[PDB]
Symmetry: D2
């Protein structure tokens, strides 16, 4: 649902840049087999920026179909215009998705009051559970704990994906919200720390290629076995880091292809193919994780 290891799944493409159903099926089967807790469909790692809203909706619907009730699906629904966020969210009302992942408006840099009004309006136009998503290095704005506290009072706003990498946020938010408000890491390299501080899981890029390890790490964390979990984390740490050696999802798509999980590593501009140096870097991190 909204704890454990949640994959921010890639949108695998053919050489033409359109969704590859065979590759998507292979990925979803992989996540089901690996014990991944849920799938975020067409988030950032899924190239939400370069898909139009129809293409976005097609991918979510296909993912839901292919999941065939075996694994929960959360739709990425972020937009920097509130009217567009509402419209996108409405496409998925009564779809079968279990909730939405919705980013702070990017580029237009709203105030904390603007963030509050944005997310409150979105929540008011849906019965779907809403997961807030904060990632200031990409958006140009920072949803602060006080505002998260304000929004947690809205019935269907039920958690946050916190991608700052600033671990002080965990307990700053936790003290402002109720005990069933979910705290998820959006920063693979600090995710275990985040869970050790009280976080409930991670929406992960690494999980695309190390789904079983990630699922197992998060289980150990939930059970309080942090030393055991850390052995897995150490094995994965080069991936946590190097999957961002070039802009996400360039590295993770290449890694998926290298592992035979997808047919091609094609992306849409302005993402470009991985450099030779990048390939070798990512290959070494895969080797270190014991996946090649």
């Amino acid at each position: 649902m909204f704890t454990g290891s949640i994959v921010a799944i890639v949108t695998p493409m053919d050489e033409k840049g359109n969704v590859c159903r065979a590759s998507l099926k292979k990925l979803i089967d992989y996540h089901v087999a690996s014990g991944t807790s849920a799938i975020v469909s067409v988030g950032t790692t899924g190239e939400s920026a370069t898909l139009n809203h129809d293409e976005h909706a097609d991918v979510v619907m296909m993912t839901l179909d292919l999941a065939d009730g075996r694994i929960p699906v959360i739709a990425g629904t972020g937009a920097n215009a509130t009217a567009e966020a509402i419209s996108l969210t409405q496409r998925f009302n009564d779809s079968g998705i279990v909730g939405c992942l919705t980013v702070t408006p990017y580029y237009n840099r709203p105030s904390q009051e603007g963030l509050y009004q944005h997310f409150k309006a979105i929540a008011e136009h849906t019965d779907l559970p809403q997961i807030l998503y904060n990632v200031p290095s990409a958006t140009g704005c920072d949803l602060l704990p006080e505002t998260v506290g304000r929004l947690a009072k809205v019935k269907n706003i039920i958690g946050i994906k916190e991608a700052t990498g600033n671990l002080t946020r965990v307990n700053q938010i936790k003290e402002l919200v109720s005990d069933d408000f979910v705290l998820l890491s959006g920063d693979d390299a600090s995710a275990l720390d985040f869970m050790q501080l009280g976080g409930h899981g991670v929406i992960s890029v690494t999980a695309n290629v190390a789904a079983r390890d990630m699922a197992q790490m998060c289980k150990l964390a939930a059970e309080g076995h942090f030393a055991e979990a850390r052995v897995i984390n150490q094995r994965l740490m080069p991936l946590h880091n190097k999957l961002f050696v070039e802009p996400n999802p360039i590295p993770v798509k290449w890694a998926c292809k290298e592992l035979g999980l997808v047919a091609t590593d094609t992306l849409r501009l302005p993402m470009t193919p991985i450099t030779d140096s990048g390939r070798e870097t990512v290959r070494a991190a895969l080797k270190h994780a014991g996946l090649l």
Copy 2:
């Protein structure tokens, strides 16, 4: 025209958030009378984020209609997906605009090679002059001088709006490009310094409400009369800063309403109304400028 004072014009709205033709007419007449060099239509200050492409195109076409050949119009055409940037650009071919202002992709954080391929592709599929736009605090990426130098070799990539406020960029770029490449500030508070270092003009928010002073300041700067320009700049400096006291364009729209230039200061979510404290700060800045 791509030198002097260029206004990043507001998109004036009625109480329902729809473009107000009467207010727009008034602003354009004001810029014609006040010596503004050109108008950037539906840039950031024009709420490009919250207009759909149809509304966007409509505002540009309305701006061209109302300008009636008396002042050049530049269209905001930026998008974080290269195919969308290209499509948006095609809408304005043979419209009568003189050029396009196109921002680095926001939120998806492309590499320098990605930025190169993005802008190259946009420029390939139009004859319109292209002005690059770098604003890392808003986008999450930074178009570096080296890449600007590469792009400047493309025939119709003719300049850059450099909004870092990092004045070292002026001569880092100038040394890598031809003498005809236009360097424009996108940071009002440092724009005179930017011109003193070699810059050719400013794409300005302040110019929305101090068009005449901005035009004179930029002409004095172009003539090398920096001390004289700086007297004007000192009167405008509170405005240069306080027009960003709350997210742009909240302050500048309020200022326009206060001066009688627009009927309402309405914005679209996630922009929200100016706070009382903001009104006070902005009004004091307007008075410092001699405008009220």
Copy 3:
């Protein structure tokens, strides 16, 4: 020794700026009564910058005398010249102090290799336990985990005071060092988080005025009772923050005087007396902690 709540004790002064023995006695008695684990004498909070080395040594020796074996004393021994760090350390060989707190060289910005050679040389000229101290916002340099790992191999380098406030450092260092290497927070506001991640205690400014609460919070943390500890943390959080409303130790000296723990709040230039606004801010934080 080197776990639990360790106070970074102020150097109380008379109106002339010299150490006040009566006030120091009162403070040490207070720490003994409160269950403080150890005292850091003439660290940063003790105005190491503005005491000469003789005055510094006099304060340490007086503190040791007054402690009279009831509470362990660690001497601040940092210097930005390695020869001076050695000389200062040598003053305390066979003194009765149980160890030294030694900061990364400030102002001259040594490399990681320079930090390594600096601390290794210091450790080689003493039998005293050495605690490394990293505080990049004050020093202009950052002792990275890899270098800490290197230094932990030196016999008498036994821990670190990590004052970055970056909680990812805890486990980055922990995985590189042996299990008896001590990890202490140098950032009051994040100290409980730091302990929850595996830290062993804190060298605290807050402990100067809330010694009993701090001791109790750290005991709960060590026992794994983080929820209980967090209630205390929440009571102290305004102090954790506002004791830096003006440069440390201006606020904490005023707070000590207000609580009747020291006779005067005098400091040495370039520290200056607390502002009226600062007094009221700190008074409110004391009130919130239930200390006034």
Copy 4:
């Protein structure tokens, strides 16, 4: 003299870390012959951190002796304790130096009021001209234009070495001070820009090895011939950057040894020898400058 090219001179050392008179003589002769405006003796580049005050005074006196009235000498006199700054300044009264270079207190992070009281007190107790020195990356504090403006009203506070590399500071300070207050860059890579904006000269590291070019560049700048100055600056830019590839003055001392200007490139801990990679980078920069 407090305009043009002023060298922040190295303190050349033998293999035991003691000042090398023969090397110092050679450097001073070089600066006399090459048109350098003045010498800053025992500043940062002179390893002020690792000389005691006796060695410090000795080097300044030796520098004055060797200069023999042929070039003005400015003493580094900065300290993070106001009483020490004052004491150090008294050592140089009637020495023959023309002024003092005095840094904002490092490590203890005083407030703006603290900085004001610090420099005011230093200036009160000498007749020597005082040049303020701001370098926040090294000190942990930032002397802001407002405070510079306050201090400039003190009779013998005559200028500032502004080493932020933030070029907006030039006119922010210039507008708050009299036309006779000297603005000097402390950041070689941005120093020509700094002069083009209104600055009067540079206290330079690069000038240690490119004294003639630096002197010509600064004279051209003062005359308004910025394009001509910039040609020189472009040849020196690799040096401006790569002299900080490892901590200053490690690169510049190696460069001086490589040119034959000093007998050895020895430094004091915590400075350590240049790496092989550093040698290669610096040598390439020297060749770009035409010096080898």
